[PDB]
Amino acid sequence: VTGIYVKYWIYVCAGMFIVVSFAGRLVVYKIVYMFLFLLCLTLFQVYYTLWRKLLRVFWWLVVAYTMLVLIAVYTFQFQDFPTYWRNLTGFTDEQLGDLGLEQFSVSELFSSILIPGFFLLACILQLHYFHRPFMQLTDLELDLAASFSAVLTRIQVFVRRLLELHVFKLVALYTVWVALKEVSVMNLLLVVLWAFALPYPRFRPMASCLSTVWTCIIIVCKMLYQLKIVNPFGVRKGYPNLGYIQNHLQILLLLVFEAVVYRRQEHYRRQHGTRQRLDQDLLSCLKYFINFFFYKFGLEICFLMAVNVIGQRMNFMVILHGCWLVAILTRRRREAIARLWPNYCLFLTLFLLYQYLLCLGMPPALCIDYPWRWSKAIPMNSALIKWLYLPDFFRAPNSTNLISDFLLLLCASQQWQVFSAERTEEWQRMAGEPNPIPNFIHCRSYLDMLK
Amino acid sequence: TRAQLVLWDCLILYNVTVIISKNMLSLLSCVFVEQMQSNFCWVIQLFSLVCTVEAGIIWDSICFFFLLLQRRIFLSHYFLHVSADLKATALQASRGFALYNAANLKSINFHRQIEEKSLAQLK
């Protein structure tokens, strides 16, 4: 129980986030404070080394802000002092009255107490667990149960190793899903920029930090624009506003968590012929088969990704780049085709931007419909509009193009891995040849019979 | 291998070319239905077309995926064992011929021993 409690550190942060999120009606000031706290937490997480320098202080400050909010809630019950505050500040108390200077119902009182009470519980947990205990906590850890635990630890380690690829894939998946659900300024643009920064390795950590910052900015804008007041257009203002950026914010948080987990794994790592191995047994051949198969056959894999998306999407511009792909296949030389790919990568990126711009419609400058789109005797008709992508009174068509684009970008990244394939002498070393093969005329290896 | 791979590669070229061609027919069919419905009323008998506005080209696409896996296998040099097999074909028949005729001979020759055994009763 003591060990579990010591390891129960992130729970306080999760509870604070939960209190911040979906706290019934939003007490504008309280909601703003919660969002600011979340943003500060993200900034510290990026700062992590700096956050390590000032983490307990951050927790104490969060507790202090919660206490201040609760005290303010008590203060607004009195009426003379809020009037005094209005007089000194010069803004109306009508806004605060909308917020509610009065002690509201059992649900409201219970929620407010729980938020301050949750803050008190979190502060107590913070006092119980020192920053050094958290640093030690980063490391993690009848007979069958112990063996299972050891196997699980080995797995966890493998997951940490694969985390870089998994994280990139997850970030892309979240971006694509968000774009498919909704397309908005900076929303798709951030994903596109991230795709721009995926090829270069060194920018990629900074790019991740900046993508997280952009996601935070988008979430902040959504929170500010959670409702529409003026009613005098590129605005959500969803009444429930359950998850405008919640999926995106969660994805960013998961990525940061993966990064921190990677740091912990690296700290632990500080602590403490393959081909014939293939011939030996199931585990060896399978592990070799999986890693080698993907790193060498990523060209084939991308070919599959391209073919599947091309069939599923079925549009003309998508088909033309597919035609580029078949032109690529015409060449039978791996080296020459490889030389050709980087320019094709640039071409696919241009395709990504072009396709998104085509999806875009109703420019913010003009409220009424398009000039070029016509009910006149212009040669175009309903067939083009069904094929073309422009929101109107009638339709804004299918967004399968984005999922196909996702496949395209990931393939580009995999192509960069292929670039590492001709390079990376140590890894490629595993990958003349006719002389070894004859020996297994009918090799007795269990694997050999199947092969 | 060189000739077979190039010619077969052309076969794959045919496959992907068909991919592009059906995409073309499908897109044109979807965009315009009225003129095509009116004349392609008979052409629809010639060729059935696409939906009103499991689905998609799934069986062919997957055949393509497996086809891709196999061409790569073909490209590899693991065929040397196979190569023995192919050359091997050239010489079996004669031996099997003899084996076959010998078996018939053996059967007929074996047949004769039983009657001398019958003669053995006579003996």
| A450 at B interface, C-beta within 8 A | no
Specify the length of chain A in residues.
451
- Burial level of B91, CB count in 10 A (0-12/13-18/19+)? exposed
| Angle at the Cα of A427 from the Cα atoms of A421 and A445, rounded to 5 degrees | 110
Phi-psi region of A352 (alpha: psi -120 to 50; beta: other; left: phi over 0): alpha
Give A363→chain B minimum CA distance, Å.
26
Phi-psi region of A362 (alpha: psi -120 to 50; beta: other; left: phi over 0): left
Is B26 within 8 Å of A310 when comparing Cβ atoms?
A: no
> How far is residue A272's CA from residue A283's CA, in Å, rounded to a whole number?
24
Give B112→chain A minimum CA distance, Å.
41
Distances (CA, A) of A45 to A210, A212, A261: 13, 11, 12
Mark the breaks in chain A: residue after which each occurs, C to N over 2.5 Å: 141, 232, 272, 431
Task: Enumerate chain B positions whose Cβ falls within 8 A of a Cβ in A.
Answer: 6, 9, 12-13, 16-17, 19-20, 23-24, 26-27, 30-32, 53, 56-58, 61, 64-65, 68-69, 72, 77-78, 80-81
Of A259, A169, A159, A175, give the one whose Cα is nearest residue A211. Answer: A175
Q: Which two tokens stand for residue A98?
A: 């909308």
Q: Establish, for the pair of chains A and B, how many residue pairs have beta carbons separated by less than 8 Å.
A: 63
Question: Are A315 and A401 spatial neighbours (Cβ–Cβ below 8 Å)?
Answer: yes
> How far is residue A350's CA from residue A302's CA, in Å, rounded to a whole number?
18
Q: Which two tokens stand for residue A29?
A: 């000031």
Mark the breaks in chain B: residue after which each occurs, C to N over 2.5 Å: 53
Distances (CA, A) of A299 to A86, A172, A333: 67, 20, 13
Q: HEC profile for B42-100?
A: HHHHHCCCCCCCCCCCHHHHHHHHHHHHHHHHHHCCCCHHHHHHHHHHHHHHHHHHHHH
Residues 6+ apart with CB under 8 A from A375: none
Phi first, then psi, for residue A184 (nearest 5°) are: -155, 165
Instruction: Sort out which chain A residues have CB atoms less than 8 A from B72's CB and list them.
Output: 297, 300
Method: cryo-EM
Long-range contacts of B93-100 (CB under 8 A, 24+ apart): none
Q: Which two tokens stand for residue A165?
A: 């690829």
Instruction: Sort out which chain A residues have CB atoms less than 8 A from B30's CB and list them.
Output: 386-387
Instruction: Give the best residue of B36, B57, B63, B67 to mutate against chain A (max A CB count within 10 A).
Output: B57
CB atoms < 10 A from the CB of A122, how many? 21
Q: How many CA atoms lie within 13 A of A63 on its CB side?
A: 18
